[PDB]
C-alpha cells in the first residue's frame, strides 16, 4: 500500500505540473487575445 | 448642345442617386481612421494566427 501510494503521489505530482502548465498556457492565450483585441 | 430637353432634371437625379449611394456605403469619416483600424485588425489577425500556430507546436503531453 505504501508503494502504491508513492506511485499515486508521483502520478499526482506529474498531473499537477501538467495542470499548472495548462493553466499558464490558458492565461497566456487569454492575455494575448485581450491585448490583441 | 449650346455650341451654336430635361437634361438638368436627369443630372439632378443622377447626383441624388450618387449621393444616396455614397451615404449608403457607411464610411462618413475620412479613410485615414478606416485604414488605421484595418491595419490594427490585420495586426490582431496576425497575432491570432501566430498564437494558433504556437499552440500546435508545444505538444509534450502523454
Give an account of the 3D structure.
Chain A has 37 residues and is mainly alpha-helical. Helices cover 95% and strands 0% of the residues of chain A. Chain A starts with a helix and ends with a helix. Chain B has helices at residues 7-23, 31-55. Chain B has two helices and no strands. Helices cover 68% and strands 0% of the residues of chain B. Chain B is mainly alpha-helical. The radius of gyration of chain B is 26 Å and the shape is rod-shaped.
Summarize the structure.
The structure is cut from a larger assembly and holds chains A (37 residues) and B (62 residues). Chain A is mostly helical. Chain A has 1 helix and no strands.
Question: Which terms would index this structure?
Answer:
part of a larger assembly, 2 chains, A: 37 residues, mainly alpha, 1 helix, rod-shaped, B: 62 residues, 68% helix, Mediator of RNA polymerase II transcription subunit 9 (chain B), Mediator of RNA polymerase II transcription subunit 21 (chain A)
Q: Per DSSP, what share of the residues of chain A sits in E-state strands of 2 or more residues? A: under 5%
Helical content class of chain B? 55-70%
Q: What is the terminal-to-terminal distance of chain A?
A: 53 Å
Main sheet attributes: strand count, strand direction, barrel closure of chain B: none
Count of DSSP E strands of chain A? 0
Number of helices of chain B: 2
Amino acid at each position: 500500500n505504501h508503494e502504491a501510494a508513492t506511485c499515486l503521489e508521483d502520478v499526482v505530482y506529474r498531473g499537477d505540473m501538467l495542470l499548472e502548465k495548462i493553466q499558464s498556457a490558458l492565461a497566456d492565450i487569454a492575455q494575448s487575445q485581450l491585448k490583441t483585441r | 448642345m449650346d455650341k451654336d430637353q430635361d437634361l438638368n432634371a436627369l443630372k439632378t437625379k443622377f447626383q441624388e442617386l450618387r449621393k444616396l449611394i455614397g451615404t449608403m456605403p457607411g464610411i462618413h469619416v475620412s479613410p485615414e481612421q478606416q485604414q488605421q483600424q484595418l491595419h490594427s485588425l490585420r495586426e490582431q489577425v496576425r497575432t491570432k494566427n501566430e498564437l494558433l500556430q504556437k499552440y500546435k507546436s508545444l505538444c509534450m503531453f502523454e
